Amino acid sequence: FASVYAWNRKRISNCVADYSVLYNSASFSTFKCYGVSPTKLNDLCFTNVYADSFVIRGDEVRQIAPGQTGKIADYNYKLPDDFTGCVIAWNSNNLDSKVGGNYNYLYRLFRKSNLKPFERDISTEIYQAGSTPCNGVEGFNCYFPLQSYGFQPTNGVGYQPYRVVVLSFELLHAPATVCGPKKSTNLVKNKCVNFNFNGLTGTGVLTESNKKFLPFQQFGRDIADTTDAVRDPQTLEILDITPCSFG
Amino acid sequence: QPVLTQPPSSSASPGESARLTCTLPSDINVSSYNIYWYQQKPGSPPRYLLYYYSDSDKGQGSGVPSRFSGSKDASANTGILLISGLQSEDEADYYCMIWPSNALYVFGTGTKVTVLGQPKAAPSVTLFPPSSEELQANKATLVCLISDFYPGAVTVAWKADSSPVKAGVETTTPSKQSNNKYAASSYLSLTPEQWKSHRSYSCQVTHEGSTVEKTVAPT
Amino acid sequence: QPVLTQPPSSSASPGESARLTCTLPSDINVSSYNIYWYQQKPGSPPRYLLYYYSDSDKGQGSGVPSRFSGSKDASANTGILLISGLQSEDEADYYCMIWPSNALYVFGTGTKVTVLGQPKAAPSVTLFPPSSEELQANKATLVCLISDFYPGAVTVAWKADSSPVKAGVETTTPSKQSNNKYAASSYLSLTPEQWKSHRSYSCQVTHEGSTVEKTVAPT
Amino acid sequence: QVQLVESGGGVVQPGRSLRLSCAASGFTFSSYGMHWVRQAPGKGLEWVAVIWYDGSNKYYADSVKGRFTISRDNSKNTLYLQMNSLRAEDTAVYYCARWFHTGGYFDYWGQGTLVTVSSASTKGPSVFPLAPSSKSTSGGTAALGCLVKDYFPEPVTVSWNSGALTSGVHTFPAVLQSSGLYSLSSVVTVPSSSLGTQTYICNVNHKPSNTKVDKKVEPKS
Ligand SMILES: *[C@@H]1O[C@H](CO)[C@@H](O[C@@H]2O[C@H](CO)[C@@H](O)[C@H](O)[C@H]2NC(C)=O)[C@H](O)[C@H]1NC(C)=O
């Protein structure tokens, strides 16, 4: 994973996202959704999804939330106050903690001012607590600004490492982007049916055709402009649409 | 390195709630550090209690009942320990610590706490001037004895004719008697020519704000 | 039965507004009772003034001008009488009463009020030790006289060499002289062996916060 | 389980050198950071030195630099502290503490050991009688006593009238001066009618030496 003071930032893009494999995986110790309850994720579409990744203590997972305070949310990773995404977290004691102490996971514990939301700060200047200038050397009131979790496998819960992923769905002003997968039933024939062909909503009897579209045309129309043929997206065969009987 | 000032010797009675404070210097925004609290009984090493930084960043100490709670007030540069529901097992010294950069570990100055299991008392004071044989012995010692002052936070100041003095004085720590109150003593070193130089000396003792002083003049 | 504490001897000058208080004990939510107020001039029986409970539940006393008004403040356990526009006919003692269950009627402790019709004064103090014939008479009496202290709320405390004493002392109530200020006296009973026991005694008097003390030592 | 014992304390004169040994047990020694922390008799705590899990971060304290050396040996589960040129003020109780790092605090202290940087060897007491006086007299009673001062060998005793008077006789805790020698004063109250009347002789006995002196206390001339 990535440190807590330099988190990563992956920009998921145009794709088919299935948040159900996430939501029901039961391997996550924390799955909170804020802008939007979890079950309705596989039914919406946004412009961009960002995924941020890092590693923290066990009992600092409560500062990854909109409107908190503490050494993590103050100056390591700040979430805006109208967050939209979801926060996922799971214990990772066996991967990240090693006997003798894993001193490779640092965090920032001194900064001049709290972070703006989604702001990032990887500098390593000597912090200056008191009024006396520091001149790049340590000493009283001149502190190195990074400390390291010394993780060890015999730590009580709440001191073992947790891995965190923060998904943030954003909606700029584009034309569209990633959405959840569209599931399909079977196509029946020779029965007055209520059908939807990737947008085309209608009613009628479906029948095997013998016309030949051009290999970019989806549906056919009549004179007086009524849909009378379609192409099945999955198998790519033309089917006529006749109305079911009235009189 | 900073210095963490702590008021010595707070006190209260069972069932009450004590509020100890630990303040840094005019510099450093105490709302920038996490404060740790240790407790030490007599005849025993200290013991971790809890730490506080910005509620929603608390933490307890594995055997520390939820009575003890920490907080932090900004516009005093002060961290606060709060005992709620004192009992007869909190007579201890409570130190505050900060840990900035694994290069230095700064401790507080200590703070006694006593749960009053008896009514208060008046520190009986008694003062003695240097005896005659000691005058012939080319030396002089003033003797200030304090006794029966059950809450033990006594302090002493010594006086020449009008001014305070701060050299040549030794002060015992309070010691518990049989009646489970305290006693103390202080000595003042003087050359006999200084003994007759000033027309009179005195020993004053302060105790819970109150003060009692005694005075003796050379012959 | 509860006890209704009242500060003795408030004071002010004409045209001002006096604010007397009547507080119960740590227990009982004074915002649960209605408080009655009585006034008593010297040489006359008391007289009802008003009662208060939770404005919109007030009540006056048939001959009590609208100057007198009662109120009640919660987070002090205190009822308040408020005179607004004192005059030269309010020198009286004001008692607060509560009536819970027609089984007991609890009175306050009294509070003097005086409208200053003269500038303040300094209580002249004078102290006398037991005379010689009284020493031969196997007894001893210290004599503390107070005079000319126009506002009459004097109190006295007696001192052996360093400690206060509270046995063998008698204190006159203040008495008005011709010049319309006050005078008082106090006596201390002592056996002559106790008279020579302690190296000196003193009489201190407190008056409007201020204090003056005099002291005498046996010979 | 986890428990740290210490040894090496004692009494030395300034300028010499000493070393302290903190032997651990229980936990696996070589996985933790260890500290030495001292506290003076009757003062607050004070951090002295730290050492990583052999990570060679020594980091002494501004008052011990250039005079203390901290080291460890995980082959025997032992922490050491070598002091030299003792300032005759580093007299205190010393503890070894274990450092829980990812939480950031000490735990499992080790009962400490006392080291006293003396300069005295042995000396007999000097006695004065503190006379009963009117400044000590109040009403029915007056106090008189004996001041026994300037002795090193801590156990010393003063009785009143060969052990006769047990009323009002109080011996106060001895005080340790900057000179390095102890001093104390024992006082007893007695009716003021009885200033000089009866016998009040303090019997001073110094057991490490062989001093035995009786001093009478009488009202001031
Ligand atoms: C959509 O997926 C289905 C299978 O999920 C594809 O169906 C396959 O079609 C080929 C014909 O070329 C058959 O040989 C395979 O056996 C079919 N698979 C199954 C599982 O039935 C279908 O072709 C896909 N859509 C497109 C446009 O290729």
Author numbering:
A (entry chain A): 347 to 593
B (entry chain L), C (entry chain M): 1 to 219
D (entry chain H): 1 to 221
Direct quotes from the study:
RBD, which directly binds to ACE2 receptor, is a major target for development of the therapeutic nAbs against COVID-19. The prefusion structure of S protein exhibits more dynamic conformational changes in S1 region, especially in RBD, which has two distinctive conformations, “up” and “down”.10,11 Only the “up” conformation of RBD can bind to the ACE2 receptor. Bivalent binding was revealed for the full-length form nAbs, which showed that the full-length form exhibits different binding mode and induces more RBDs to the “up” conformation than the Fab-form that is monovalent.
In pattern 1 that includes P2B-1A10, P5A-3A1, P5A-2G9, P2B-1A1 and P5A-2G7, two “up” RBDs are bound with nAb. The results showed that after 120 min incubation, some nAbs such as P2B-1A10, P5A-1B8, P5A-2G9 and P5A-1B6, induced about 80% shedding of S1 subunit of the S protein. The first group, including P2B-1A10, P5A-3A1, P5A-1B8, P5A-2G9, P5A-1B6, P2B-1A1 and P5A-2G7, has the largest overlap between the epitope and the ACE2-binding site on the RBD. Their epitope residues are distributed across the receptor binding motif (RBM), mainly in the cradle region. Among the 17 RBD residues involved in ACE2 binding, more than half (8 to 15) were recognized by the antibodies in group 1.
